[PDB]
Amino acid sequence: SSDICIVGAGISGLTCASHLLDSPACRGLSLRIFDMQQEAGGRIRSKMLDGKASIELGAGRYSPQLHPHFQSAMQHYSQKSEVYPFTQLKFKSHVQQKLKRAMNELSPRLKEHGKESFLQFVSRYQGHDSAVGMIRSMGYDALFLPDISAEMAYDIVGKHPEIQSVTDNDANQWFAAETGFAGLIQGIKAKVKAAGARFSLGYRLLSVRTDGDGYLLQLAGDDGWKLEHRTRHLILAIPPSAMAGLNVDFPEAWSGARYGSLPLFKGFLTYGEPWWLDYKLDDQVLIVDNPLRKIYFKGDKYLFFYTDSEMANYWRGCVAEGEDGYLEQIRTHLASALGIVRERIPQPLAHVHKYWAHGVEFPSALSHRDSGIIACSDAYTEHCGWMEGGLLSAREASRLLLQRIAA
Amino acid sequence: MKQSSDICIVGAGISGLTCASHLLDSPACRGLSLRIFDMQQEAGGRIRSKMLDGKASIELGAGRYSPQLHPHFQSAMQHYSQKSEVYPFTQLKFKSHVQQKLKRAMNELSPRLKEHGKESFLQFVSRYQGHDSAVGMIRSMGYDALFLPDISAEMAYDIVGKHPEIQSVTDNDANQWFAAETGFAGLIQGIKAKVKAAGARFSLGYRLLSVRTDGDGYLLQLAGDDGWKLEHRTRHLILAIPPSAMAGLNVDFPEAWSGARYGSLPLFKGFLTYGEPWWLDYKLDDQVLIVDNPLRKIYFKGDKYLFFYTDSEMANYWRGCVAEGEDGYLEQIRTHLASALGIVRERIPQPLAHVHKYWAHGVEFCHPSALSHRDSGIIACSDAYTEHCGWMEGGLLSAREASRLLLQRIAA
Ligand SMILES: Cc1cc2c(cc1C)N(C[C@H](O)[C@H](O)[C@H](O)COP(=O)(O)OP(=O)(O)OC[C@H]1O[C@@H](n3cnc4c(N)ncnc43)[C@H](O)[C@@H]1O)c1[nH]c(=O)[nH]c(=O)c1N2
Ligand SMILES: Cc1cc2c(cc1C)N(C[C@H](O)[C@H](O)[C@H](O)COP(=O)(O)OP(=O)(O)OC[C@H]1O[C@@H](n3cnc4c(N)ncnc43)[C@H](O)[C@@H]1O)c1[nH]c(=O)[nH]c(=O)c1N2
Ligand SMILES: [Cl-]
Ligand SMILES: [Cl-]
Ligand SMILES: [Cl-]
Ligand SMILES: [Hg+2]
Ligand SMILES: [Hg+2]
Ligand SMILES: [Hg+2]
Ligand SMILES: [Hg+2]
Ligand SMILES: [Hg+2]
Ligand SMILES: [Hg+2]
Ligand SMILES: [Hg+2]
Ligand SMILES: [Hg+2]
Ligand SMILES: [Hg+2]
Ligand SMILES: [Hg+2]
Ligand SMILES: [Hg+2]
Ligand SMILES: [Hg+2]
Ligand SMILES: [Sm+3]
Ligand SMILES: [Sm+3]
Ligand SMILES: [Sm+3]
Ligand SMILES: [Sm+3]
Ligand SMILES: [Sm+3]
Ligand SMILES: [Sm+3]
Ligand SMILES: [Sm+3]
Ligand SMILES: [Sm+3]
Ligand SMILES: [Sm+3]
Ligand SMILES: [Sm+3]
Ligand SMILES: [Sm+3]
């Protein structure tokens, strides 16, 4: 049993646990935290690549200008940051240069035509085909969705480091975690644990029912063992896709909005020599019209690519066919991306990859209209798709729960 | 990119791997592609061997076999050059009064088996000295499944006689028992390597979700550990998975397969290693203790380690104990070990390392040795369909039949 139960040990659930444990208003209550995975962090996942190279299979960068709450958290938990170099396109193509002119020249038309789709909006510059080539050169295939409006896309573009240069956020700075964002997760977890909260990792919430003034949760361990938990206050710090698997009538009984998701894929490769130094590619990012889409060269340490939507599924399908075919395709697409023959690309010594079926999903926190369960996720904020959104939702979720306790 | 095969086997346990080996050896089957799925990242299923701390091979799943009862398993160990060793837990060195009394009771009651052998084991034994005495006797066998109302006296007599710790209760001492010198995982890997070298393709980490007939073949929907959906087309399908897994699919199990029903029980094993073999002072090495105590069955493996093995409610008890935290779980073992050994709690030290495994459906039970879908022709393979339900020998027997059933389909 517990007074307060949080389902989800991502940055959102851990942060709202920290807020509640700090509050002098509800001191002494027991706090129980569940997560279906054996480790906290959710879509924050830091790994060591072969030798001594820390890499981010999930969230990777932040901007102090856009994400003040996240910068504050990094400093609060004494987490060191380092410069994130992939904030400009050094070898801009013609279509990328033309994109900048189109974005700025069409920008005043956002006032009256901001609601139409981004593709249709950009088509005003030189027609459909030209718009496709320009939008493609930003490396985020989500921008082609018909639901994303022009003003919505301008906001999205202005938030990403590789392409911010085409917006009024072109002065924003970007950083990464020196040791990986896992260090921040573990910092919050240790503080929450030292304060007396109980963690039950490896238990998935299946269903919830109202039990008088509290709730009865049905969970299952990853070995199938069924567990029941009673709580007085419940926060679901899980993304919308996870809410759909529950029996809580999401989103109908929570808000008047709908939610969607897109897959994401990252692949990291190390080599015997930093061969890309010969092409002056260290600390540069290339956005290309081939399945790699976005290629990054981190100093002299490793390279990686990052894609979404259909290309993420393509690479995951490529992994399911075998490692040899997977690395072969990477080698082919690296060669064409660099404009050189395949034989000049070496073979890697080690590699790791990660596929997120719902890597990105889209009031800062929600409440069930009848039961009072609180829902916490970046998808409910103006920073959907960003760790900052989780912190904003967590602050609002803890505020909602404190009002529930004080009532 | 498209996934397709002539033959698909879902399940990389001993049953699925063996029927793959049979099919690859068949001359009337050469040239066909074979694809093998399993939801786990490693083959073996309920065979799971691990290294406890330094150098100590332990069996979190299947642990022992008898060459008298399980000749196909013995032959497989030999065929793949897997060395065996004596399984020492075959006698009760400290027979309790209730254990001695149950042997006498089952003997003296045996003339009543003809007329009353169909009633529950508990009710049958109750005819000796009443209900309470029967509970005490049956409890001392260490297998709580024997209390189930669906386990008849006739069934229990056979069950008692085929388990190493209590086989002496029905004078079945002629059964030798062996374990793997390096773990039964070595046998699994031996089969897998043979199957892989023969051309079969393994896709581990993919769980079958549903199956639909697709003309003369089948269309499979699978999901990887990361939620990625995989579609696979095959012509011939063997589901080498237990009944509980079959019931999770959309293949009308067991209605379209047999007239029998199927059940399961949970199992739990816990292993502990210490800085010294403290149990040697009590002459417990290579001995097993059966106790009216949540540990139920306590084993001491030479001077290497000890473990306990439980089923049914006590399996769930220890799993809930794990959920409370390692400290409370280890201290609960310490308390129950002291009570079982009749020694002071402080005399038992704390373990250096430990590991445990909970099998929600550790044993599955219920008539040919393999089944077929009366409409779609899908083949099912499991130890639960054999007279050796709950034993690896059953998987080997089911695989023989399943392979013959598929070869018939291929030749039709
Ligand atoms: C590849 C990639 C790249 C990026 C990013 C993501 C990904 C996948 N992000 C987004 C960022 O990772 C994201 O916004 C936050 O990590 C979300 O944190 P939450 O805790 O809200 O959800 P998150 O998904 O992290 O955690 C939810 C937790 O709930 C658990 N859970 C779900 N259902 C459950 C159930 N039924 N029972 C029990 N537990 C359950 C899950 O296991 C999970 O641990 C990012 N952001 C950013 O700021 N900068 C960046 O550069 C990027 N880049
Ligand atoms: C604790 C304990 C102790 C013992 C035993 C079990 C346990 C749990 N057994 C019984 C023995 O483990 C059992 O008889 C065989 O291992 C069963 O082999 P199968 O391959 O038939 O099923 P098994 O369950 O081993 O394998 C089935 C495989 O199918 C896979 N699968 C299931 N559904 C799937 C899906 N939808 N998609 C993809 N894959 C799927 C599973 O992941 C699994 O690998 C035993 N026997 C014995 O002879 N002597 C002994 O001492 C013991 N003791
Ligand atoms: Cl995901
Ligand atoms: Cl007596
Ligand atoms: Cl199981
Ligand atoms: Hg609290
Ligand atoms: Hg509190
Ligand atoms: Hg491939
Ligand atoms: Hg491929
Ligand atoms: Hg959103
Ligand atoms: Hg939260
Ligand atoms: Hg074959
Ligand atoms: Hg064959
Ligand atoms: Hg406990
Ligand atoms: Hg306990
Ligand atoms: Hg059976
Ligand atoms: Hg089989
Ligand atoms: Sm042009
Ligand atoms: Sm206008
Ligand atoms: Sm997901
Ligand atoms: Sm994004
Ligand atoms: Sm394929
Ligand atoms: Sm006696
Ligand atoms: Sm007596
Ligand atoms: Sm009579
Ligand atoms: Sm508890
Ligand atoms: Sm099971
Ligand atoms: Sm048994």
UniProtKB/Swiss-Prot annotation, chain B:
Q: Which Gene3D superfamilies is this protein grouped with?
A: FAD/NAD(P)-binding domain (3.50.50.60)
What keywords is this UniProt entry annotated with? Answer: Antibiotic biosynthesis, FAD, Flavoprotein, Magnesium, Metal-binding, Oxidoreductase
**Enzyme category, top tier:** oxidoreductase
How cofactor binds (record note)?
A: Binds 1 FAD per subunit. Binds 1 Mg(2+) ion per subunit.
Q: Which SUPFAM superfamilies match?
A: FAD/NAD(P)-binding domain (SSF51905)
- An example Gene Ontology molecular-function term: oxidoreductase activity
What biotechnological or industrial uses does this protein have? Violacein production is used as a biosensor for the detection of quorum-sensing AHL production. Violacein possesses antibacterial, antiviral, antimicrobial, antileishmanial, trypanocidal and potential antitumoral activities.
Q: What upregulates it?
A: By N-acylhomoserine lactone (AHL).
- UniProt entry tagged with the keyword Metal-binding: yes
What residues bind Mg(2+), as annotated?
Answer: G13, G16, A240
Record field: catalytic activity: L-tryptophan + O2 = 2-iminio-3-(indol-3-yl)propanoate + H2O2; 7-chloro-L-tryptophan + O2 = 3-(7-chloroindol-3-yl)-2-iminopropanoate + H2O2
- Listed binding positions for substrate are R64, H163, Y309
Q: What is the effect of changing V363Q?
A: Retains 17% of wild-type activity
| Sites where the protein binds FAD | S15, D38, R46, R64, L208, M392
Which cofactors, by name? FAD; Mg(2+)
Function as written in the Swiss-Prot or TrEMBL entry:
The enzyme generates the imine form of indole 3-pyruvate (IPA) from L-tryptophan (L-Trp), with concomitant two-electron reduction of O(2) to H(2)O(2).
Assembly and interactions? Homodimer.
- Name-wise, this protein is Flavin-dependent L-tryptophan oxidase VioA
To which species is this protein native? Chromobacterium violaceum (strain ATCC 12472 / DSM 30191 / JCM 1249 / CCUG 213 / NBRC 12614 / NCIMB 9131 / NCTC 9757 / MK)
